[PDB]
């Protein structure tokens, strides 16, 4: 997703990171098994650097992979 | 407590002013009718005893097991209650008959009655059951009196009925 | 509020009893009454403010003083207020007519008349003029059942008043 | 406790008051110093208007103390429907939504997010709501920035108590309510060092919220139904902490922002610390 | 002993006040009726005998059983009872007629009723029965309000007995 | 949620049987008022705006202090609460209009109405009194409109009054 | 109940000791001022009426909605309850100031009264405002009386002032 | 708590009227005393420690037996237990001294006295001793109305125990 | 009666105790008062008359229309009433100050003042007046707390009045 505007209100430096989705990080609200949306199998988000580690071990967790970060700006 | 009258009054009260001329004229129809009205009540009082007898007769062939031991209506001393309460409900409603307003039987049975029925365990549907099983008999008597001026009834007939469903409504 | 029809009702409901032959009667004598009453409540309905104006004016004349600076009857807030009261007084009337009982009158007027009265200094007396000056003008427009009503209710302020 | 009468047979609006008893007010008659029966420490009943100024009196003269009064005609009412809540309904922003699937979003967003509360023209966020719909922004992350808001902040978190707001979030971004004293006091302390933004991080951040509407999904309320690692209670706290519908999380109303669940509640469905 | 009047008295009493129109207008009630119970008590207490017989009897047919020896029915000293009864049931109603209110019938009949009953093992079945079969018969030598009257009193009992 | 049909139903099913031949008929006319039914609801609808702006009028008119420094309906920002939840209430009872059943209006809006209102300190009176000087309004266009075939909506028209009733009753 | 002298005592027996020279300090000092304490007391008492019978009227003049149809001290019945309360409140002001210390008034008189006021509708705002009025005028009577010996309450006057303040706070 | 003030306000709550002169009257007696009461509590206080070590002692000479051991006198626990309670009785009637009541007494010493002291076997006759004691040597150190007030409040107590 | 002393008795003897020093220091404040108290009533006693014509005067200055025909202030019987009255109003006062508690001016005058008052329409209004007028003539034939005292029990009418 590339970012129109910092997303963030509180500043920091901001790193764009593409992430392999699992079925579990974004589940669709579907009877039977969760599907991950097709037309995203690489959900990208811009995150601050303080959120940056949270972020990336939640990711890790979760099945998903990251594909690559880069800085967002 | 209220009553059809009262509650014109205080309405408009708070308006702050006389009665309107429109309004006078609901109350002016009201008092015509009374003779009807008054009849009405008399039959369910005279007729009380029987419409519950009946109505419960009808309850517990239909629900069985209220009978049966660990149901609600077991044992006698359960039965006993059980009955009285029949009876209440509907002393309510023809007082509310009477009124014209539904206030005094809200008021004075419904409002906490269902949670009250609930913590014991009686079985609200069960109650509600009844009341109409009630409803239907008594409805019979208002409608089907002897020695009476022959002449339509329904007007009370149907705020009869909304009584006894208000009644069945907020236990259930 | 005490009506005929509230009554019986609450005797009933509470020696848990039916509403027997005894109680209908005495809600056939009301309802009955009720034509009469209601058509005294049209006769006051209508003539209101006349009777307003007409005892307002009166107390001013019975009580000269009144009128004068540094008294109650001074200055035109207070005359304002003179009529309002005297409105109300009228107005609950009317009410209780056609309630068929004193409910009415008893829940908005009477219950703490006193120290209201006390506590603002309105003297009783000023009233039960504005009061009979009405019913004098009343004995006019109503006849037979119909006046006997309303003057019941006008009295049964005098009384409570005095 | 149920009031079983809106009014006395005189017209006459009861009024349900709750005291805590003291010797003097109930004694048992027995030998020995005066006591009232423990399962009565706080005593109700349901007085008329009339004899209310007495009964209250009486009461504070003794050593009574007043806990609370209320009008018996809002006592004695049902618990709340659950009718809305009992399957939430959820809403699925899928990627190239069209303009008004968009806009469903954010109004049950705003919805969820703030309560029933009302949110003006002025007081809504044209900048968040911009991002959402261009990408960029995911539901979760807009639920973030709401959360953030100085209208969140106002309503919730800046009027009442942390342990107040800690339970006024749980609902809003969780559907379940608070379950057991811990949760309550690991919140606290993550404030009080890491700060207001920190926290609001945790909910979003928390795997329950990754488990249930993980990323774009409107959170719905999942308590009301049976839910894993759930204490019984917690279903019980849903009824005090969702108060019907058009009922709200409101600062403006009379001393606005308290507490729904008591804190010995909590203590039941576990304690340790 | 209840009647509309007694009660109106009562209440006025029970809160301290002279009779204002409230309670008048009930009495009213009571008083206009009354033309027609006075009617009803005429023709009741006219037919009284006959009416007894009649229901004695019916109450026999109904349970045949009672006349055969060695029952309650059996044996004259025991249908004199029965006929007794009934008419003191009878006379009772007629003065409830007279004094406009349940009053007559509460103290004497209804009050301790069931224990009666039940130590001497009468079945209010019976009575009943007996009610009945009158209610039909009077439901031919009256009419109107004077009818009505009639009922509800008759009824009255019939519920308190069952 | 509930309506008229499915309410049937549920009754039904606890009794446990198929839908007695008698309630089928009172759906069945329900059916074939739709028409009429419907066109009352869209009379609403297109003159939703102008309802409440009337009534908002007339109640402002009447209770001059709500608007005054100090009253509930001042300032601005508790004008405007006022006026939207006039609406909503209006958009509900409409609702209840099409489904042929109170219960959407009591459980979404009703329910719990009155103690938030108490809470805030808005006087249950007065929203009362708005709710009535809406229905009045109301009622006006439902009952005649333009373009419309003649025929008698009275019966759809009462229901209508009751819903804003028991909205007026349970907020008061 | 407590005053001035039990309170410092109840604080002492907490830390298990006999009272500290410099606390008999406080009260030896209390007792000196006695007599203008009284002398406070007594102007209260010995103008209670008028305080309040001032205060309400300007109370009235401000809100005139509250003795409108409608409003909250409409009509006589409820206009009499808000006198009587009103000099409740004095009335243990007064107490309070005897004894030299809050508690009793928050005890006896404010516990229980801002919820009261809730449930019954009774608009707190008003009701502080009441408090105020009467306070201001209550001051003036303390602060310039007759007969009495000429020296400086102020002291007083303030203690006065913060007790009529912890009422209109718990109420409002 | 009872002390002069708080009854008068009691009094007068109870009755729902206004402090009026009667009360006040009361009240300045409460503090024209207080100049004597506060005296006579500064001298306790200052004393106190040699005061308690008088009365202990004491009480051990007049109950020779309550020092061998196997009984309660025996054993310094008990000694320090003996001490702390008299310098409670000492502390609470300075207390009530300050207080102008005996209130203070009341509440901690008096209420439950009995069982307290059944249930424990403590003696009442020791503390009076060791109250006596102490009334003696106050007797030398206060004078006038101090000494009066002094005394009062240690009385109160011997007629509690005893 | 409400005196101080019976009072402090009252309270005793509820409670079923012994007066033990609390209430005897409130006895003790009634008696240093009434040096004060005492001087007053002399003063009050001895004036009476001359403060009593000076009050039914002022009285009719303040309410000129009193004095008219067909008014309550006019003709001799009345004005001699109007006398006789203040008088009491005055000797119970003095009896207060002696009796040391509002007591005597309670059951005399208090009790049943409004009903009294409403029955023959005697205005409050106008006895205020009386008795302000008196305050402010005793506001110089005493002083200090001999004043204080007067201007207590003075106004405790005024309150009661009003
Ligand atoms: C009968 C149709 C059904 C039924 C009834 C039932 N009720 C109770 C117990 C109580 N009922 C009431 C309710 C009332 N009392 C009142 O005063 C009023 C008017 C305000 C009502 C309507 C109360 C007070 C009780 C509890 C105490 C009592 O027994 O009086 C029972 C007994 C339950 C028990 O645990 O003993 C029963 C059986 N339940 C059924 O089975 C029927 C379907
Ligand atoms: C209606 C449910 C059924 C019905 C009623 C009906 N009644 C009348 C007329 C009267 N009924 C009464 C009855 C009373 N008046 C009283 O004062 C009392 C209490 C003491 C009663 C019970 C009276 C007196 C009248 C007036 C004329 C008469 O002789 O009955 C009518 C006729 C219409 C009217 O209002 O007059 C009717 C229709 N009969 C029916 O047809 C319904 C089934
Ligand atoms: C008319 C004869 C005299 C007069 C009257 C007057 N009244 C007031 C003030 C009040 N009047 C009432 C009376 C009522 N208010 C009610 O709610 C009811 C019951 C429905 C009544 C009968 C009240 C309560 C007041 C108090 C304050 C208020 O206005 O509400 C005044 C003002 C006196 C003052 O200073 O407060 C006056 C003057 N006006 C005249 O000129 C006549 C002498
Ligand atoms: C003693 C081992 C511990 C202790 C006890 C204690 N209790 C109180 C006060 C109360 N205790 C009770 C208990 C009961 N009331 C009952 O009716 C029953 C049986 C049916 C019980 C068991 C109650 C109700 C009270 C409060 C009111 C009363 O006095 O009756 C206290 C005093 C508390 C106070 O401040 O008043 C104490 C001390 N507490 C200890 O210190 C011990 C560890
Ligand atoms: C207007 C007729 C009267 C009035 C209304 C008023 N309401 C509020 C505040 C709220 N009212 C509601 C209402 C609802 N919540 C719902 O969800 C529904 C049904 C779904 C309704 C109808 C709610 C939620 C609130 C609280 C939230 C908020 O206030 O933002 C106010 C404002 C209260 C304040 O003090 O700010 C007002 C004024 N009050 C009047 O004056 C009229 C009599
Ligand atoms: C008639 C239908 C049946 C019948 C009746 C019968 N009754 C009794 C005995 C009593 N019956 C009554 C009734 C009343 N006595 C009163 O004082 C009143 C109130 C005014 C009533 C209604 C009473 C009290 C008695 C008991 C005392 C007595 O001896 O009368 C009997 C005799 C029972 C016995 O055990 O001897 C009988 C048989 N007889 C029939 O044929 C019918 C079956
Ligand atoms: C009743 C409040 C007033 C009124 C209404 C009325 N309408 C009809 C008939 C129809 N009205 C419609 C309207 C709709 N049907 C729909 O499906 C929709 C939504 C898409 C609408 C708006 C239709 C189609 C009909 C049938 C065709 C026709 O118009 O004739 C009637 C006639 C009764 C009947 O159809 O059975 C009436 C009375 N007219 C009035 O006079 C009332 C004031
Ligand atoms: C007057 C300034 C305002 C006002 C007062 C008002 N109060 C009531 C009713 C009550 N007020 C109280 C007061 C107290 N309860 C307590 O415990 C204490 C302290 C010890 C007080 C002072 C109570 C108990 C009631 C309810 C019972 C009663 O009859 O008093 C009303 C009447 C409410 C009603 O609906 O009847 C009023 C009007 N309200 C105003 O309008 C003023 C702003
Ligand atoms: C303070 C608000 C005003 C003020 C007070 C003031 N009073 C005194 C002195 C005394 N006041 C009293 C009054 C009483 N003593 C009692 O025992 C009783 C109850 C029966 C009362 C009412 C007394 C006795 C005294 C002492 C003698 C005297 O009057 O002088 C003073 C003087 C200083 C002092 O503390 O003694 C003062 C200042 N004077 C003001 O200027 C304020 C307006
Ligand atoms: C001294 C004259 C004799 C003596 C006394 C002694 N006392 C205890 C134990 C207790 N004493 C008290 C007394 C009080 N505790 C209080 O809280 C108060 C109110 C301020 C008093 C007066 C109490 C309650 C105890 C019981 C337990 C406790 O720990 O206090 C003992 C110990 C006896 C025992 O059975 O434990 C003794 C011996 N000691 C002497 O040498 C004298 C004969
Ligand atoms: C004086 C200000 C006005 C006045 C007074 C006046 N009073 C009466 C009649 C009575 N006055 C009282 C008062 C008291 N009687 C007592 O026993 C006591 C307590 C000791 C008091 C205060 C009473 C009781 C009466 C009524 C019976 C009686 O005759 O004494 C009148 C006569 C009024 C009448 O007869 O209806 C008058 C005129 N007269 C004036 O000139 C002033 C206006």
Redesign the pocket.
């Known amino acids: 997703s590339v970012l129109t505007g910092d997303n963030q209100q509180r500043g920091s430096k901001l790193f764009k990171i593409t992430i392999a989705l699992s079925p579990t990080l974004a589940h669709h609200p579907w009877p039977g098994l969760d599907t991950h949306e097709p037309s995203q199998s690489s959900y990208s988000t811009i995150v601050s650097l303080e959120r940056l580690l949270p972020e990336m071990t939640r990711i890790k967790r979760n099945g998903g992979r990251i594909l690559e970060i880069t800085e967002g700006e | 407590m209220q009553d059809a009258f009262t509650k014109a009054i205080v309405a408009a009260d708070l308006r702050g002013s006389f009665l309107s001329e429109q309004e006078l004229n609901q109350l002016t129809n009201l008092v015509?009718?009374?003779?009807?009205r008054?009849?009405?009540?008399?039959?369910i009082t005279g007729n009380a005893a029987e419409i519950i007898s009946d109505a419960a007769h009808k309850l517990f062939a239909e629900q069985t097991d209220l009978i049966r031991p660990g149901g609600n209506a077991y044992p006698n001393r359960r039965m006993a209650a059980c009955l009285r309460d029949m009876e209440i409900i509907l002393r309510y409603v023809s007082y509310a008959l009477l009124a014209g307003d539904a206030s005094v039987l809200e008021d004075r049975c419904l409002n906490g009655l269902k949670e009250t029925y609930v913590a014991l365990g009686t079985p609200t549907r069960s109650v509600a059951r009844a009341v109409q099983l009630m409803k239907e008999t008594a409805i019979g008597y208002?409608?089907?009196?002897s020695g009476?001026?022959?002449?339509?009834?329904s007007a009370?007939?149907n705020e009869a009925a909304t009584y006894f469903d208000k009644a069945a409504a907020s236990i259930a | 509020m005490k009506t005929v029809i509230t009554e019986v009702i609450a005797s009933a409901d509470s020696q848990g009893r039916f509403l027997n032959?005894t109680e209908?009667?005495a809600?056939?004598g009301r309802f009955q009454r009720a034509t009469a009453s209601m058509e005294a409540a049209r006769a006051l309905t209508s003539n209101a403010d006349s009777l307003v104006k007409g005892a307002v004016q009166e107390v001013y004349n019975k009580f000269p003083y009144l009128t004068q600076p540094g008294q109650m009857g001074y200055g035109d807030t207070n005359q304002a207020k003179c009529a309002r009261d005297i409105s109300h007084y009228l107005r609950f009337i009317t009410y209780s007519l056609v309630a068929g009982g004193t409910g009415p009158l008893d829940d908005y007027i009477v219950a703490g008349l006193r120290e209201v009265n006390r506590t603002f200094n309105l003297s009783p007396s000023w009233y039960i003029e504005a009061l009979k000056h009405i019913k004098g003008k009343v004995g006019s427009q109503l006849s037979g059942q119909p006046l006997t009503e309303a003057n019941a209710y006008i009295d049964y302020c005098i009384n409570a008043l005095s | 406790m149920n009031v079983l009468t809106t009014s006395s047979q005189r017209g006459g609006k009861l009024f349900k008051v709750t005291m805590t008893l003291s010797p003097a007010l109930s004694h048992h008659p027995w030998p020995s110093l005066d006591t009232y029966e423990p399962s009565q420490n706080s005593y109700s009943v349901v007085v008329p208007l009339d004899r209310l100024l007495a009964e209250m009196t009486y009461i504070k003269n003794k050593g009574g103390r007043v806990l609370d009064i209320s009008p018996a005609d809002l006592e004695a009412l049902g618990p709340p429907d659950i009718s809305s809540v009992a399957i939430p309904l959820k809403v699925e922003l899928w990627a190239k939504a069209d303009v008004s699937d968009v806009q469903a979003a954010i109004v049950a967003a705003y919805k969820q997010i703030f309560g029933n509360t009302y949110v003006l023209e002025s007081e809504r966020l044209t900048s968040a709501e911009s991002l959402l719909r261009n990408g960029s922004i995911s539901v979760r992350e807009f639920v973030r920035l709401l959360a953030k808001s100085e209208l969140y902040k106002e309503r919730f978190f800046f009027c009442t108590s942390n342990n107040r707001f800690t339970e006024l979030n749980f609902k809003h971004f969780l559907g379940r309510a608070p379950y057991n004293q811990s949760e309550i006091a690991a919140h606290l302390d993550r404030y009080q060092t890491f700060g207001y933004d920190a926290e609001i991080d945790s909910y979003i951040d928390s795997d329950e919220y990754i488990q249930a509407f993980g990323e774009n999904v409107v959170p719905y309320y999942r308590g009301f139904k049976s839910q894993s690692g759930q204490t019984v209670e917690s279903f019980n706290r849903m009824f005090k902490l969702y108060r019907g519908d058009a009922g709200s999380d409101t600062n403006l109303n009379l001393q606005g922002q308290k507490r729904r669940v008591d804190p010995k509640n909590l203590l039941r469905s576990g304690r340790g610390i």
Not at chain 2, 142 to 145: A, C, F, K, L, R
């Open positions: 015509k009718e009374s003779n009807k008054l009849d009405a009540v008399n039959a208002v409608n089907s009196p009476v001026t022959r002449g339509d009834c009370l007939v | 032959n209908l009667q809600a056939n």
